[PDB]
Amino acid sequence: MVEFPEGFVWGAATSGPQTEGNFHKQHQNVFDYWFATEPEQFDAGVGPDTASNFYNDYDHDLALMAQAGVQGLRTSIQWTRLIDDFETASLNADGVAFYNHVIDSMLAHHITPYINLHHFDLPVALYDKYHGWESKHVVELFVKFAEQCFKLFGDRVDHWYTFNEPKVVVDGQYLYGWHYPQVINGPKAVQVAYNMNLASAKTVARFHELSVRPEQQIGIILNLTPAYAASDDPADLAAAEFAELWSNNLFLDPAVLGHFPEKLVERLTMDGVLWDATPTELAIIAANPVDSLGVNYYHPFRVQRPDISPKSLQPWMPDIYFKEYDMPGRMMNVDRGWEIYPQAMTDIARNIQKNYGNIPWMISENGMGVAGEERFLDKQGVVQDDYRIDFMKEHLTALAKGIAAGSNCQGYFVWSGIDCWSWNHAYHNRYGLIRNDIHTQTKTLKKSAKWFAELGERNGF
Amino acid sequence: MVEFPEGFVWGAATSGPQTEGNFHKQHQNVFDYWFATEPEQFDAGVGPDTASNFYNDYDHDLALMAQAGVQGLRTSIQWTRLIDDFETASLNADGVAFYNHVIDSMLAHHITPYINLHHFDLPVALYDKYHGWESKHVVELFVKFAEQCFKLFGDRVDHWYTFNEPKVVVDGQYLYGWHYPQVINGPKAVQVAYNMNLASAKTVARFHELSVRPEQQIGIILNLTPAYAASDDPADLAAAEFAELWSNNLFLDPAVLGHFPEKLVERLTMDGVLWDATPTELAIIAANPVDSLGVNYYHPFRVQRPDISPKSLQPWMPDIYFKEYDMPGRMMNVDRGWEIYPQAMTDIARNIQKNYGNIPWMISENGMGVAGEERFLDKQGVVQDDYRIDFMKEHLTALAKGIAAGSNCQGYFVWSGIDCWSWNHAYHNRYGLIRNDIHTQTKTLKKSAKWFAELGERNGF
Numbered sequence: 001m002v003e004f005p006e007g008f009v010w011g012a013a014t015s016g017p018q019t020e021g022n023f024h025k026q027h028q029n030v031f032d033y034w035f036a037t038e039p040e041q042f043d044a045g046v047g048p049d050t051a052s053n054f055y056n057d058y059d060h061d062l063a064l065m066a067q068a069g070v071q072g073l074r075t076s077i078q079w080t081r082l083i084d085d086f087e088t089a090s091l092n093a094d095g096v097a098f099y100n101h102v103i104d105s106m107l108a109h110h111i112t113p114y115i116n117l118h119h120f121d122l123p124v125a126l127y128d129k130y131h132g133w134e135s136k137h138v139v140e141l142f143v144k145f146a147e148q149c150f151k152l153f154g155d156r157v158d159h160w161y162t163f164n165e166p167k168v169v170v171d172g173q174y175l176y177g178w179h180y181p182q183v184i185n186g187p188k189a190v191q192v193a194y195n196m197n198l199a200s201a202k203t204v205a206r207f208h209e210l211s212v213r214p215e216q217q218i219g220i221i222l223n224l225t226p227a228y229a230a231s232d233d234p235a236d237l238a239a240a241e242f243a244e245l246w247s248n249n250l251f252l253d254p255a256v257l258g259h260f261p262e263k264l265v266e267r268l269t270m271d272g273v274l275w276d277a278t279p280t281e282l283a284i285i286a287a288n289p290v291d292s293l294g295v296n297y298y299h300p301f302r303v304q305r306p307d308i309s310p311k312s313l314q315p316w317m318p319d320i321y322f323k324e325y326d327m328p329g330r331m332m333n334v335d336r337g338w339e340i341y342p343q344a345m346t347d348i349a350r351n352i353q354k355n356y357g358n359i360p361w362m363i364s365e366n367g368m369g370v371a372g373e374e375r376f377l378d379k380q381g382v383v384q385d386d387y388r389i390d391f392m393k394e395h396l397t398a399l400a401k402g403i404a405a406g407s408n409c410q411g412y413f414v415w416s417g418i419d420c421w422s423w424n425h426a427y428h429n430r431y432g433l434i435r436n437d438i439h440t441q442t443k444t445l446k447k448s449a450k451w452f453a454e455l456g457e458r459n460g461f
Numbered sequence: 462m463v464e465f466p467e468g469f470v471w472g473a474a475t476s477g478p479q480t481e482g483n484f485h486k487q488h489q490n491v492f493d494y495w496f497a498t499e500p501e502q503f504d505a506g507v508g509p510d511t512a513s514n515f516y517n518d519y520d521h522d523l524a525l526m527a528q529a530g531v532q533g534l535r536t537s538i539q540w541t542r543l544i545d546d547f548e549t550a551s552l553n554a555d556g557v558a559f560y561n562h563v564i565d566s567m568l569a570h571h572i573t574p575y576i577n578l579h580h581f582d583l584p585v586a587l588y589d590k591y592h593g594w595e596s597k598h599v600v601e602l603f604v605k606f607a608e609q610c611f612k613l614f615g616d617r618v619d620h621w622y623t624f625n626e627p628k629v630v631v632d633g634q635y636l637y638g639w640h641y642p643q644v645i646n647g648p649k650a651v652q653v654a655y656n657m658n659l660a661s662a663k664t665v666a667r668f669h670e671l672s673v674r675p676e677q678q679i680g681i682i683l684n685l686t687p688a689y690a691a692s693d694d695p696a697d698l699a700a701a702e703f704a705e706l707w708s709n710n711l712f713l714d715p716a717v718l719g720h721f722p723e724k725l726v727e728r729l730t731m732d733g734v735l736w737d738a739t740p741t742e743l744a745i746i747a748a749n750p751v752d753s754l755g756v757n758y759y760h761p762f763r764v765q766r767p768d769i770s771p772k773s774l775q776p777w778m779p780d781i782y783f784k785e786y787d788m789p790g791r792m793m794n795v796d797r798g799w800e801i802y803p804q805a806m807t808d809i810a811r812n813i814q815k816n817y818g819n820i821p822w823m824i825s826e827n828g829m830g831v832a833g834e835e836r837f838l839d840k841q842g843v844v845q846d847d848y849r850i851d852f853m854k855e856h857l858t859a860l861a862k863g864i865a866a867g868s869n870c871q872g873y874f875v876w877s878g879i880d881c882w883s884w885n886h887a888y889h890n891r892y893g894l895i896r897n898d899i900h901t902q903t904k905t906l907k908k909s910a911k912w913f914a915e916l917g918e919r920n921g922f
Contacts, residue, residue: 022900022901022902023514023517023901023902024901024902024903025901028900032900035900036900039505039506044500044506045500045505045506045507046506049511049899049900049901049902050510050511053484056484056517438510439483439489439493439496439497439508439510440483440484440485440486440510441483441484441485442485
């Protein structure tokens with residue numbers, strides 16, 4: 001009734017920081033330090049020190065994911081676990097040993113590894129010493145960490161990603177207080193977006209200098225969620241224009257086309273907040289676009305005119321040009337606060353096909369987070385998460401229309417395999433096909449896990 | 462300068478609930494349920510779910526305890542981990558295998574096991590089903606649990622304990638709200654004190670039926686701090702008399718002499734709150750005294766006359782006869798609010814010598830808790846806990862005065878080897894010879910750890 005291309009990958013996505021726990025980890029990332037000093041900023045004071053116990057229980061957790069139909073698992077390597085000295089990227093022997101264990105264990109459970117290098121987990125010491133992603137020297141230290149990952153694990157990992165959602169690092173660390181250091185500074189944010197695009201292009205370049213087999217490829221993972229104008233009012237259309245350039249093109253265009261979006265550069269310049277770039281850096285970005293795209297999609301983005309004129313006396317923010325809009329009658333993931341709009345999948349697919357060379361891409365994250373899932377347990381402690389199955393069906397239906405129209409989508413990864421630690425929200429909302437009882441770290445397939453395994457067997461539903 | 466008997470045992474003490482974490486544990490004990498229910502009752506919301514990670518890191522943790530001079534480790538087996546069906550004491554095979562690994566690992570590190578059966582960790586389902594320690598049926602199920610421990614581990618463990626401080630279970634669960642379920646009921650407390658005494662004698666009986674070697678002994682661990690009278694004013698001395706019959710004789714006399722203190726039975730009968738016993742139960746108590754005594758001491762205990770007459774119209778509580786007294790001029794550990802009075806050790810040693818047959822005994826707990834020990838890290842990472850060393854010097858010196866005068870003391874167990882979870886206080890105070898960074902579960906010897914090691918080799922200081 002709804003079928004998918006031959007070879008389509010059915011996978012799951014997590015990250016190191018949200019699964020491993022902090023057991024024996026050498027360095028604190030910014031979230032580790034945030035929790036150590038202000039535990040009250042986290043749901044129930046549950047931080048990342050244990051998370052979903054993946055450091056200790058990886059082998060059996062991978063077996064459960066394989067049970068759940070996870071043919072590919074995408075997670076991340078922590079800079080703060082792998083590296084001893086950041087300046088030279090010397091190696092923490094115990095951390096290298098741990099990532100070889102989980103990659104080997106993925107293979108033994110017949111899971112294809114997809115390895116992302118960075119997922120919101122900047123080392124706090126590099127923020128204290130250089131201001132983190134503001135520093136083009138920190139950019140270089142990142143590339144040297146990437147180089148080690150490629151040399152250590154490239155022999156049995158084909159599929160890599162530089163970053164998960166750099167835009168969330170920019171927004172979170174420098175615009176809205178979501179991430180420690182909670183800086184609130186538009187111009188810095190512009191430089192950080194620049195610096196992270198540059199780090200990604202420099203990592204792509206080093207990846208291909210070091211690759212040995214043709215099937216090795218490196219990509220990036222972004223939100224491509226479209227900006228719908230609230231109305232056809234010119235002021236709402238103009239707000240949606242800028243929201244689109246700034247939330248999507250800022251990263252999509254340099255990663256895939258090789259250059260920054262022309263209209264955005266012009267607006268940033270006119271406002272006096274343009275990044276500092278050099279011709280040599282821009283040439284690196286132009287010469288090393290990603291091999292593939294990971295699309296994270298959860299909810300649409302709707303936007304109307306700003307309440308006050310953008311020429312008002314205020315600190316510069318991208319938000320001076322647009323304000324978020326609530327559509328009456330929207331479908332809502334309420335205990336979460338997000339709109340549910342599957343059709344955006346189709347728009348994204350068409351946009352990639354028409355405007356971005358129909359580059360090979362995957363849905364790298366799609367999922368629904370729900371609170372208090374103990375209420376939906378049945379007589380055997382199996383969460384009856386039909387809502388999650390229906391949510392997956394609605395978005396997969398939309399995806400398949402994009403594919404039949406000709407968009408080069410090659411896989412679908414659910415967020416997430418096993419309930420994992422959702423930053424300051426901790427375990428308030430669950431996303432997994434597999435429930436984790438975090439008091440005992442005992443995990444059990446949900447109803448959606450068996451549906452997912454069957455979806456992969458029939459390559460459809 | 463201050464020496465100790467040949468063959469003195471230099472040890473450390475903990476418990477399972479305070480170290481293991483709840484990783485893969487089948488059942489919740491009362492503290493597990495309490496934290497799952499009311500995490501706000503726990504410092505910083507830090508519960509038992511990870512504790513000091515002993516479930517995962519036992520082998521290396523025992524190595525560090527060996528470096529710190531721990532020749533005997535006293536800890537406990539968790540009823541809620543070992544047993545599948547409480548009614549039949551059927552075995553949980555992963556919990557059985559876990560205790561087999563730590564006991565074997567203790568042996569390989571040249572650490573003599575000291576295994577205690579119960580440290581405040583009643584399974585909450587047995588309180589729901591039967592009201593817990595109020596049930597003489599639960600008394601039997603505990604004996605069945607002890608049976609299983611002796612058969613699985615008795616081939617390698619010589620030294621056993623029935624309970625760690627039953628009085629704290631009485632006081633905590635039924636008098637002052639320290640332990641879930643926080644019942645406030647004096648008469649119920651009297652019956653629970655009786656039932657736990659009876660559980661212990663029955664366990665001692667079973668233990669000797671199933672004994673295989675003569676070296677195998679089993680004891681009980683109690684607080685025997687004297688109840689010092691505030692003055693020689695007859696109301697004060699009479700208060701100290703009941704305080705001692707109640708806080709010490711309630712368990713000392715059944716455990717060692719095989720009967721309850723006659724003046725205490727008389728008092729509770731007069732007030733109409735006395736336990737329900739049978740002659741056969743009393744005969745089992747009389748026929749199975751303990752083989753040895755573990756003594757816990759931290760701080761002294763002083764009492765004065767109650768403020769109102771004990772005949773006043775109020776719910777019966779042991780405290781209607783005595784009130785805590787603060788002595789002008791006391792030597793205090795001010796941050797912890799505890800008096801320092803080392804000679805109480807010497808008084809305890811004399812009491813066991815004179816009145817309790819000089820039964821073989823050890824100091825099963827003694828130690829000092831301090832908050833924010835990060836203040837005394839040298840930048841080599843070692844806590845400079847000179848205060849802990851001086852504390853041990855004073856108390857070992859007073860204990861030596863007792864051994865010299867003829868007290869049959871055989872060992873000194875520090876609380877604790879590694880920093881562990883102190884119930885609702887969690888990790889606010891640290892007692893260890895070894896420091897635990899509970900964010901990373903990375904452990905490091907303190908200064909006192911090297912001191913304790915040299916103390917054991919020199920057998921003095």
